Scaffold this active site. Structure first.
Site, PDB file in Angstrom:
ATOM      1  N   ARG A  63       0.833  -1.190   0.000  1.00 58.69           N
ATOM      2  CA  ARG A  63       0.000   0.000   0.000  1.00 58.69           C
ATOM      3  C   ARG A  63       0.881   1.259   0.000  1.00 58.69           C
ATOM      4  O   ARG A  63       1.779   1.401   0.841  1.00 58.69           O
ATOM      5  CB  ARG A  63      -0.907  -0.024   1.232  1.00 58.69           C
ATOM      6  CG  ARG A  63      -2.199   0.725   1.070  1.00 58.69           C
ATOM      7  CD  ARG A  63      -3.254   0.201   2.036  1.00 58.69           C
ATOM      8  NE  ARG A  63      -4.523   0.891   1.835  1.00 58.69           N
ATOM      9  CZ  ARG A  63      -5.096   1.696   2.728  1.00 58.69           C
ATOM     10  NH1 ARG A  63      -4.520   1.925   3.904  1.00 58.69           N
ATOM     11  NH2 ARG A  63      -6.247   2.278   2.438  1.00 58.69           N
ATOM     12  N   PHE A  68       1.137  10.644   2.675  1.00 57.54           N
ATOM     13  CA  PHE A  68       0.775  10.062   3.964  1.00 57.54           C
ATOM     14  C   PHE A  68       1.779   8.980   4.371  1.00 57.54           C
ATOM     15  O   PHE A  68       2.670   9.244   5.188  1.00 57.54           O
ATOM     16  CB  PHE A  68      -0.674   9.513   3.907  1.00 57.54           C
ATOM     17  CG  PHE A  68      -1.152   8.866   5.189  1.00 57.54           C
ATOM     18  CD1 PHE A  68      -0.524   9.118   6.413  1.00 57.54           C
ATOM     19  CD2 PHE A  68      -2.243   7.992   5.169  1.00 57.54           C
ATOM     20  CE1 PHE A  68      -0.972   8.508   7.595  1.00 57.54           C
ATOM     21  CE2 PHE A  68      -2.702   7.377   6.353  1.00 57.54           C
ATOM     22  CZ  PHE A  68      -2.061   7.637   7.566  1.00 57.54           C
ATOM     23  N   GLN A  71       3.176   1.308   3.347  1.00 60.53           N
ATOM     24  CA  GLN A  71       3.159   0.161   4.246  1.00 60.53           C
ATOM     25  C   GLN A  71       3.728  -1.097   3.602  1.00 60.53           C
ATOM     26  O   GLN A  71       3.536  -1.349   2.392  1.00 60.53           O
ATOM     27  CB  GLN A  71       1.738  -0.128   4.749  1.00 60.53           C
ATOM     28  CG  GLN A  71       0.635   0.676   4.105  1.00 60.53           C
ATOM     29  CD  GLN A  71      -0.715   0.532   4.830  1.00 60.53           C
ATOM     30  OE1 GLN A  71      -0.894  -0.346   5.684  1.00 60.53           O
ATOM     31  NE2 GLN A  71      -1.666   1.394   4.482  1.00 60.53           N
ATOM     32  N   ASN A 110      -0.228  -2.081  13.133  1.00 60.03           N
ATOM     33  CA  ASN A 110      -0.859  -2.950  14.108  1.00 60.03           C
ATOM     34  C   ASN A 110      -2.339  -2.909  13.845  1.00 60.03           C
ATOM     35  O   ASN A 110      -2.805  -2.167  12.980  1.00 60.03           O
ATOM     36  CB  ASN A 110      -0.544  -2.492  15.547  1.00 60.03           C
ATOM     37  CG  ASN A 110      -1.148  -1.140  15.893  1.00 60.03           C
ATOM     38  OD1 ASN A 110      -2.346  -0.904  15.709  1.00 60.03           O
ATOM     39  ND2 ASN A 110      -0.319  -0.246  16.410  1.00 60.03           N
ATOM     40  N   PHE A 121       5.251   0.770   8.524  1.00 61.06           N
ATOM     41  CA  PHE A 121       5.002   1.767   7.499  1.00 61.06           C
ATOM     42  C   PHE A 121       6.084   2.836   7.622  1.00 61.06           C
ATOM     43  O   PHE A 121       6.760   2.942   8.666  1.00 61.06           O
ATOM     44  CB  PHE A 121       3.566   2.344   7.587  1.00 61.06           C
ATOM     45  CG  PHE A 121       3.252   3.102   8.856  1.00 61.06           C
ATOM     46  CD1 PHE A 121       2.811   2.428   9.997  1.00 61.06           C
ATOM     47  CD2 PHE A 121       3.329   4.496   8.892  1.00 61.06           C
ATOM     48  CE1 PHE A 121       2.446   3.132  11.162  1.00 61.06           C
ATOM     49  CE2 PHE A 121       2.965   5.212  10.052  1.00 61.06           C
ATOM     50  CZ  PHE A 121       2.524   4.522  11.186  1.00 61.06           C
ATOM     51  N   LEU A 130      -1.386   9.593  14.650  1.00 60.86           N
ATOM     52  CA  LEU A 130      -0.970   8.219  14.938  1.00 60.86           C
ATOM     53  C   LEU A 130      -0.143   8.154  16.216  1.00 60.86           C
ATOM     54  O   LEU A 130       0.208   7.064  16.676  1.00 60.86           O
ATOM     55  CB  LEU A 130      -0.145   7.628  13.781  1.00 60.86           C
ATOM     56  CG  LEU A 130      -0.780   7.639  12.387  1.00 60.86           C
ATOM     57  CD1 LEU A 130       0.171   6.984  11.399  1.00 60.86           C
ATOM     58  CD2 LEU A 130      -2.132   6.913  12.422  1.00 60.86           C
ATOM     59  N   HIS A 134       0.837   4.008  17.374  1.00 58.43           N
ATOM     60  CA  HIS A 134       1.809   3.197  16.645  1.00 58.43           C
ATOM     61  C   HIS A 134       3.185   3.468  17.204  1.00 58.43           C
ATOM     62  O   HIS A 134       3.530   4.603  17.481  1.00 58.43           O
ATOM     63  CB  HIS A 134       1.767   3.520  15.140  1.00 58.43           C
ATOM     64  CG  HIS A 134       0.488   3.102  14.478  1.00 58.43           C
ATOM     65  ND1 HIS A 134       0.315   1.860  13.910  1.00 58.43           N
ATOM     66  CD2 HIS A 134      -0.705   3.730  14.369  1.00 58.43           C
ATOM     67  CE1 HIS A 134      -0.931   1.738  13.484  1.00 58.43           C
ATOM     68  NE2 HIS A 134      -1.571   2.861  13.751  1.00 58.43           N
TER      69      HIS A 134
END
Length: 173
Positions: A63, A68, A71, A110, A121, A130, A134
């Site tokens: 992805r 942004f 991943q 996760n 990522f 985040l 994370h």
């Protein structure tokens, strides 16, 4: 000044069957050692689960969301659902001392509190929403341009790259 240097690993990235350069990544053993060690062992390609080597070599960045994050790390199912760790199964969130305050940071993917595995990522931009969710454990210290190369890959549904973006080779520096 006399503090032991953090371990460094590298990712040789391939896009569409063409090598596009090396990214050198510092792992924060001095902030999140258990998380850093999990990642380091998967970069060697010599870590074995039930006698079989498991690690990032050949794994995909399933992805890519420009502006942004990117991943990858799913060397189990290669689609974002795979979970594995050197501790066997999911492991706890070590700490959230570091924030997603800049591009080029490595953070654990996760599916909720304490569900860390092998997936991670790389931030393409800061993403403070985040923080505290994370675990940040490393960053690109050389070759950030390769991350930008990945970021520009054409993607299709769910932002899956249309061309394979793979960790052609990886290991320790």
């Amino acid at each position: 000044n006399s503090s032991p240097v953090n371990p460094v690993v590298f990712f040789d990235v391939s896009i569409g069957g063409q090598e596009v350069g090396r990214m050198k990544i510092e792992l924060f053993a001095d902030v999140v050692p258990k998380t850093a060690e999990n990642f380091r062992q998967f970069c060697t390609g010599e870590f074995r689960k039930d006698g079989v080597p498991i690690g990032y070599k050949g794994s995909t960045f399933h992805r890519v969301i420009k502006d942004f994050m990117i991943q990858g790390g799913d060397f189990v199912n290669g689609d974002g659902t795979g979970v594995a760790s050197i501790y066997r199964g999911p492991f706890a969130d070590e700490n959230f001392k570091l924030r997603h305050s800049a591009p080029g940071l490595l953070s654990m993917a996760n599916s909720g509190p304490s569900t860390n595995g092998c997936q991670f990522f790389i931030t393409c931009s800061k993403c403070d929403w985040l923080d505290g969710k994370h675990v940040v454990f490393g960053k690109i210290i050389d070759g950030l341009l390769v991350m930008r190369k990945i970021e520009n890959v054409p993607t299709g549904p769910n932002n899956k790259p249309k061309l394979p973006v793979v960790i052609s080779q990886c290991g320790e520096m």
